Amino acid sequence: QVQLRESGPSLVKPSQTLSLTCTASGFSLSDKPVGWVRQAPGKPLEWLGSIDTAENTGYNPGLKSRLSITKDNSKSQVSLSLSSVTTEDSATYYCATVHQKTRKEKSCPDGYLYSSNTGRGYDCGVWTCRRVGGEFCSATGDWTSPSEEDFYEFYVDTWGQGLLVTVSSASTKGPSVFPLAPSSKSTSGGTAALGCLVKDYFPEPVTVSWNSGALTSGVHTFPAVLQSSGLYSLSSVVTVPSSSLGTQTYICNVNHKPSNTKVDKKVEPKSC
């Protein structure tokens, strides 16, 4: 199966050169062309560049003076470099297999078709663009010569997972995980909601699971808020049976890869 995994820093200082690596799986880089696409917060998808089987590279024009893309077929990797980054370069970056193909075809205008026969079927001999319905072989308004045209084919085949890159002069900060334990008045009948508050981390993302992924019923990791301090805060909640509170232990597994941090916080019940 074809997979592409992005790797690199989650945080880059302004003016530095963001460098990312794409590990390919399930195909040879000497077979499929590989390109990069990014999306900024609230912005549309933006093309970056691509490298083909013949090592020829093609970039977004507006960014060409800052982009460099290289390939290693042996290590099966594709590297992207974007220089002089700013906060506008904070985005999600994907690598992907792309289809690119130029078609040096011949073309006739609209209402004309490549033929050697009039509308009635009289054989003119020579092949050329003839007007549909026309009855003369050499009348001025009944033929024209084929014009050579290039038709470009592009699309994105299989997408990678996507790496969130944040450009900022602020430094990394690990999260602080606090419990959100349900009191006796907080329950909802046979079920209760309990969670984890992941406070003050930078940069994004943070993912939260429950009981090492074994507890999936009702799990929802909320979006993060950006506080005025520049740090993020996040909450995760899970629905558990109210009868099990005090018996079954519940632990939230917070992961913050930008700081290489993993926190397993045990949410113990409130005594009220």
Partner: protein
């Protein structure tokens, strides 16, 4: 950038269309692609070559092109189709891709639901760290438009409030969260704090008190 509608809406089981307008040098060249972006998942290629269905894509998705305007048509609109949709085309080169401005698709007809609101007071650990955060989680509601207000005792409080934008859960209902950041002294002074969630005219208010545990 290929002009797309900013946001469109359709009904379940119905048919919806999304336009993609450009010029003679891109969409006019005759090779438009369509991609579906679901919040969380990776981008998914839906259509290539104006009309060709991508591998694994259901027949409900269709692609067409008229002149400088491509169109993605989704028939039998399902609930899992709520996503952003982008068009793309080459331009004067097979390596110079231009994408569209994107269209957010909203699926209508799903059942309405009043929000379940849970208000967590500051944990003992956080208070021991000289911090206080009131957390207000809002789950299982539709449509996805709520408004949160905070009450200190019975007066309205606005400073230190941070609220997320509603986002869909795994059960396809919307969820949101609100935070009130207080110093332990502020948490101890007033007698109670309240989170008011307004959804379709209804107002569900939860309340926590520092006198309790």
């Amino acid at each position: 950038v290929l002009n797309q509608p900013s946001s469109v809406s359709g009904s379940l089981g119905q048919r919806v269309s999304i336009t993609c307008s450009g010029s003679s040098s891109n969409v006019g060249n005759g090779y438009v692609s369509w991609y579906q972006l679901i919040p969380g998942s990776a981008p998914r290629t839906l259509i290539y070559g104006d009309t060709s269905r991508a591998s694994g894509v259901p027949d409900r998705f269709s692609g067409s092109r008229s002149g400088n305007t491509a169109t993605l048509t989704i028939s039998s609109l399902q609930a899992e189709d709520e996503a952003d949709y982008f068009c793309a085309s080459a331009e004067d080169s097979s390596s110079n891709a231009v994408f569209g401005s994107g269209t957010t698709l909203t699926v209508l007809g799903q059942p309405k639901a009043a929000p379940s609101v849970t208000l967590f007071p500051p944990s003992s650990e956080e208070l021991q760290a000289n911090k206080a955060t009131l957390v207000c989680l809002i789950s299982d509601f539709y449509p996805g438009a709520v408004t949160v207000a905070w009450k200190a005792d019975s007066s309205p409080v606005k400073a230190g409030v941070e609220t997320t934008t509603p986002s869909k859960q795994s059960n396809n209902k919307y969820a949101a969260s609100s935070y009130l950041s207080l110093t332990p002294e502020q948490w101890k002074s007033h007698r109670s704090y309240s989170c008011q969630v307004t959804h379709e005219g209804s107002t569900v208010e939860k309340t926590v008190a520092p006198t309790e545990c």
